[PDB]
Enzyme design. Structure first.
Site, PDB file in Angstrom:
ATOM      1  N   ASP A   1       0.825  -1.204   0.000  1.00 28.62           N
ATOM      2  CA  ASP A   1       0.000   0.000   0.000  1.00 28.62           C
ATOM      3  C   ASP A   1       0.860   1.255   0.000  1.00 28.62           C
ATOM      4  O   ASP A   1       1.342   1.668   1.042  1.00 28.62           O
ATOM      5  CB  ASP A   1      -0.912  -0.012   1.229  1.00 28.62           C
TER       6      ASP A   1
ATOM      7  N   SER B   1      -0.915  15.693 -11.791  1.00 27.63           N
ATOM      8  CA  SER B   1      -1.179  15.366 -13.182  1.00 27.63           C
ATOM      9  C   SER B   1      -1.440  16.628 -14.003  1.00 27.63           C
ATOM     10  O   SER B   1      -2.009  17.592 -13.511  1.00 27.63           O
ATOM     11  CB  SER B   1      -2.388  14.425 -13.271  1.00 27.63           C
TER      12      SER B   1
HETATM   13  N1  LIG Z   1      -4.179   3.237   0.852  1.00 23.83           N
HETATM   14  N2  LIG Z   1      -4.651   4.565   0.883  1.00 23.83           N
HETATM   15  C1  LIG Z   1      -4.948   5.189   2.025  1.00 23.83           C
HETATM   16  O1  LIG Z   1      -4.758   4.674   3.128  1.00 23.83           O
HETATM   17  C2  LIG Z   1      -5.545   6.557   1.897  1.00 23.83           C
HETATM   18  C3  LIG Z   1      -4.724   7.676   2.021  1.00 23.83           C
HETATM   19  C4  LIG Z   1      -5.252   8.950   1.899  1.00 23.83           C
HETATM   20  C5  LIG Z   1      -6.594   9.127   1.657  1.00 23.83           C
HETATM   21  C6  LIG Z   1      -7.427   8.034   1.530  1.00 23.83           C
HETATM   22  C7  LIG Z   1      -6.901   6.759   1.645  1.00 23.83           C
HETATM   23 CL1  LIG Z   1      -7.971   5.415   1.430  1.00 23.83          CL
END
Ligand SMILES: NNC(=O)c1ccccc1Cl
Length: 330
Positions: free
Chosen positions: A35, A199
């Protein structure tokens, strides 16, 4: 050093990708969700509330001769989708695709939310955002990438996610056979702890390119592409019968539709997401209404270049002293 590991979609929709990770001695292999939008490496474990474990492989630190409890340390995280987990912390040896880090913080879950329990295919997360987001208290811990960086041949990792197919995470090198043309690099802000970039615009199908700055994060842990409401409306307006459904929670479209592509700008370069990548299938089993893969970020507070966008590219996460992001077609 380098590492290279295959990443595999968890289901037929590419809802997420899992990558095998070796933890402890002897190795315990868990399938983790890499992630780039978070910074905790956490796992289902022998400490996880039994009723919250349903098919996951667990890490058992008492069976690892290299595991050490990190005294006093706890962690607790909440994700953008409303899910959460928390527990305590060990340090142990962690290897990904042949690349080994000793003394990695492995966050052992005592509690996980229902969405994690309900997903038997994901044994934990491996965060690859900046360590400033790590939730361990009272002593914040470093990500796997952070710990490995100095030892890597080059201080980079790459994401090459597949569409309905396996892909690859590489650490420490750029595989020049994995993409076409050139890699276009673009500036990153680490101020919010993310791989945040801007972007240069977008196109819908064969339409003209709209030059407009879109600030967002490269987030392998988010399934879909979340963009400003104006952009998303322009996309779905090209799909007959598409509409935003408050009851479903986003744009839906007739499953009989042929979806147009979506192009996003990276500097002067262009990444094209094929229409098929934007189809997330029936909203419920047997329905002829299908869920869209491009959704509004309004009310998230940030635009998110999730898997729908990233899997259309070869993506370089450059962790040099001034980080940058690179995108190539493939
Ligand atoms: N894997 N992405 C996250 O943990 C995330 C980071 C910032 C905003 C929203 C999310 Cl869902």
């Amino acid at each position: 050093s380098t590492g290279s590991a295959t990443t595999t979609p968890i289901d037929s929709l590419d809802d997420a990708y899992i990558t095998p990770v070796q933890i402890g001695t002897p190795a315990q292999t868990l399938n983790l969700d890499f992630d780039t939008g978070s910074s905790d490496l956490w796992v289902f474990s022998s400490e996880t509330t039994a009723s919250e474990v349903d098919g996951q492989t667990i890490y058992t630190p008492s069976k690892s001769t290299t595991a050490k409890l990190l005294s006093g340390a706890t962690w607790s995280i909440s994700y953008g989708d409303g899910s959460s987990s928390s527990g305590d912390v060990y340090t142990d040896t962690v290897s990904v695709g042949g690349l080994t880090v000793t003394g990695q913080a492995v966050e052992s879950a005592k509690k996980v939310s229902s969405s994690f329990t309900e997903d038997s295919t994901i044994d934990g997360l491996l965060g690859l955002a900046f360590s400033t987001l790590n939730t361990v208290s009272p002593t914040q811990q470093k990500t796997f990438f952070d710990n490995a960086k100095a030892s890597l041949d080059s201080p980079v990792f790459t994401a090459d996610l597949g569409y309905h197919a396996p892909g690859t995470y590489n650490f420490g090198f750029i595989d020049t056979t994995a993409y076409t043309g050139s890699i276009t690099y673009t500036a990153v802000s680490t101020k919010q702890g993310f791989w945040e970039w801007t972007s240069t615009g977008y196109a819908v199908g064969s339409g003209t390119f709209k030059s407009t700055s879109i600030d967002g994060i490269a987030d392998t842990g988010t399934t879909l592409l979340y963009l400003p409401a104006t952009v998303v409306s322009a996309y779905w307006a090209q799909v007959s019968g598409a509409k935003s459904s408050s009851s479903v929670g986003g744009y839906v479209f007739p499953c009989s539709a042929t979806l147009p592509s979506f192009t996003f700008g990276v500097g002067s370069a262009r990444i094209v997401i094929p229409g098929d990548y934007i189809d997330f299938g029936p909203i419920s089993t047997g329905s002829s209404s299908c869920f869209g893969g491009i959704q509004s970020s309004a009310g998230i507070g940030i635009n998110i270049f999730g898997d729908v966008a990233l899997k259309a590219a070869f993506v370089v996460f450059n962790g040099a002293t001034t980080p940058t992001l690179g995108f190539a077609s493939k």
